[PDB]
Design a protein around this ligand. Structure first.
Ligand SMILES: C/C(=C\COP(=O)(O)OP(=O)(O)O)CN
Ligand code: SF4
Length: 309
């Protein structure tokens, strides 16, 4: 059975920075380090940081006075930031810079009293954080997930309207939402394309190339990872069987019995060791040497704040 590896796969720049922020804060200050939300949506990373002294919380009122608190890579609302500011806490922010860029646009529209539309999935912490940059009751902030949601939305002043997106969406489905937005609200203003980041675009292009060759695609990522679920969904929609798995122990032998080509990728929050263990298990199940596909080079790095060097 041939094993193919998608490229790119695995950690993006924001995740690598965010994890380093939590590790370096543990090495500098010691345990406990409080983190608002799973730093990244990966069970393997979160469980090991928890064992090393990180405590993951959702609400700032779970954090004791005098603590160190780090906001997760997905970002937080201004209400969460200001609640931490008013409390007796040392705060470090692991928000990815490509999330922060979206936040600043939502904050500008709020100041102006002008309405914004976010394209994203309700309940996800990045969506709560970005909708949480808007606070002017004269304007408005609306969430749409689909073209059907666009076709139901009314706004107060469609001549002064803008849109933003979650960073980790399906590139194809988001194009369909934007095309609805522009039909319904011809004067709406946005970026040239969307706010989907380079890592999400590149991992989706890579799993498209992988699924063209492979019968079955395994995506290493946790169930609560939006970007990882997009990779499994893409391969499924191409008619391939695709499974989102935490680790090699999740692989059921039926999924790959008598399969000639199996593909493996990883979401932006999954460490490489988990892919290397998946490959070793597929080799037990009859696969040969893993073959990496040719892929788009990534070259972006985000550095940790100098306070955590
Ligand atoms: C931090 C982040 C993405 C990194 O992957 P993740 O932690 O799995 O998160 P998501 O659920 O894909 O947003 C949102 N930009
Ligand atoms: S998936 Fe994109 S926006 Fe999110 S942490 Fe990674 S680089 Fe940043």
């Amino acid at each position: 059975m041939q094993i193919l590896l998608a490229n790119p796969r695995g950690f993006c720049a924001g995740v690598d920075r965010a994890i380093s922020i939590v590790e370096n804060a543990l090495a500098i200050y010691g345990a406990p380090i409080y983190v608002r939300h799973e730093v990244v949506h990966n069970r393997y990373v979160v469980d090991s940081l928890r064992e090393r002294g990180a405590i993951f919380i959702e609400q700032i009122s779970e954090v004791p006075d005098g603590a160190i608190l780090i906001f997760s890579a997905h970002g937080v609302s201004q209400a969460v930031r200001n609640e931490a500011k008013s409390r007796d806490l040392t705060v470090f922010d692991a928000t990815c810079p490509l999330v922060t860029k979206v936040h600043m646009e939502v904050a500008r529209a709020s100041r102006r009293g002008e309405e914004s539309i976010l394209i994203g999935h309700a309940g996800h912490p990045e969506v709560e954080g970005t909708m949480g940059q808007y606070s002017n009751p004269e304007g408005g902030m609306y969430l749409v997930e689909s073209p059907d949601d666009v076709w139901k939305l009314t706004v107060k002043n469609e001549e002064k309207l803008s849109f933003m997106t979650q960073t980790t969406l399906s590139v194809d489905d988001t194009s369909d939402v934007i095309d609805a937005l522009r039909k319904r609200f011809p004067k709406i203003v946005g970026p040239r394309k969307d706010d989907i980041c380079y890592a999400t675009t590149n991992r989706q292009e890579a799993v498209r190339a992988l699924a063209e060759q492979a019968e079955v695609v395994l995506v290493v990522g946790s169930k609560n990872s939006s970007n990882s679920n997009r990779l499994a969904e893409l391969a499924q929609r191409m008619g391939k069987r695709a499974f989102l798995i935490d680790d090699a122990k999740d692989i059921q032998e039926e999924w790959v019995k008598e399969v000639k080509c199996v593909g493996v990728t990883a979401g932006a929050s999954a460490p490489d060791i988990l892919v290397q263990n998946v490959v070793a298990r597929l080799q037990q199940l009859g696969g040969g040497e893993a073959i990496p596909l040719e892929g788009r080079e990534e070259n972006i790095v985000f550095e940790v704040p100098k306070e955590l060097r």
